[PDB]
Design a protein around this ligand. Sequence first.
Ligand SMILES: Cc1cc([C@@H](C)Nc2ccccc2)c2nc(N3CCOCC3)cc(=O)n2c1
Length: 321
Amino acid sequence: GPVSVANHLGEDAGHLALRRDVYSGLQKTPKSLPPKWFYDTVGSELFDQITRLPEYYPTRAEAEILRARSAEVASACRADTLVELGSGTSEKTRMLLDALRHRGSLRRFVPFDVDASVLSATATAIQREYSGVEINAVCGDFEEHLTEIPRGGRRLFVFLGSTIGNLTPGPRAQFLTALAGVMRPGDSLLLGTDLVKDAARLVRAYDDPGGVTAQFNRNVLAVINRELEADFDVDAFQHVARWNSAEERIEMWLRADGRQRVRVGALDLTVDFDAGEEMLTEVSCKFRPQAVGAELAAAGLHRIRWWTDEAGDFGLSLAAK
Ligand SMILES: Cc1cc([C@@H](C)Nc2ccccc2)c2nc(N3CCOCC3)cc(=O)n2c1
């Protein structure tokens, strides 16, 4: 099938965005950085390791559901077009593509992500694996370019991994509203949400004894040091995973041990850390079944299927426009 890739981001858009997030985030109280910047090359490779840890159940729990339910996804949505809000590199992507193709309705794959080189590799992989499928990769970001997704016949939008949990309620409602805005009647959204559960299990999933998550978290400082000529003493920042009971979310923090002064050279910026000051690097909201259905409703989408894994650890929602 034909491949296309459309790039709506400027060549330096990634670097401009990083400059903005860091100039802004290192000046908030508390300091905070968005989790999208964990995922450079080293960081993406560390994330792969995390998904294979015994502590980190979300990846396998979601794959367990999709292994068992992809055909039920395919029969309810009846999509001819799979839109992945993501890079399309995972096994789950092929599980859904396999199920739409088993149905015979699969015509088009639309991976939508911010890294055009990954999208190009993904498009070549799918083109080699799925004959007669057209791939229309779209390089754009959520806040501007969701309108540039092709119309197709009937579209299944896919947002897996409980990545929606990185948005707190305010931004999360804005995102779901905008996504529902670009969907057309007859489209559907497959959404993965990690579920509230025993808090000790949740912390463990974000602070494995082997230290992999700690290295993943510390890597954002390495990314800033490298990309913006900074002098974070990375090992002076301790990994801290917290359960926030009242907000029902995991939080990843980096805790300064002793006072630190950090100079970000590209930004002409100097910031100060108190001894014990913690900086927020990721929010991971955990959900309850009924609240996910209500948040989808508030955005204009109607949930028509809900599936958990055998342990009730992880949820998949299918919601139609
Ligand atoms: C390409 C990519 C990007 C992410 C980052 C950008 N997210 C995000 C999404 C919207 C807004 C802000 C942040 C990601 N986040 C994942 N998460 C797993 C569950 O716990 C924490 C979040 C998994 C995973 O594959 N991502 C893959």
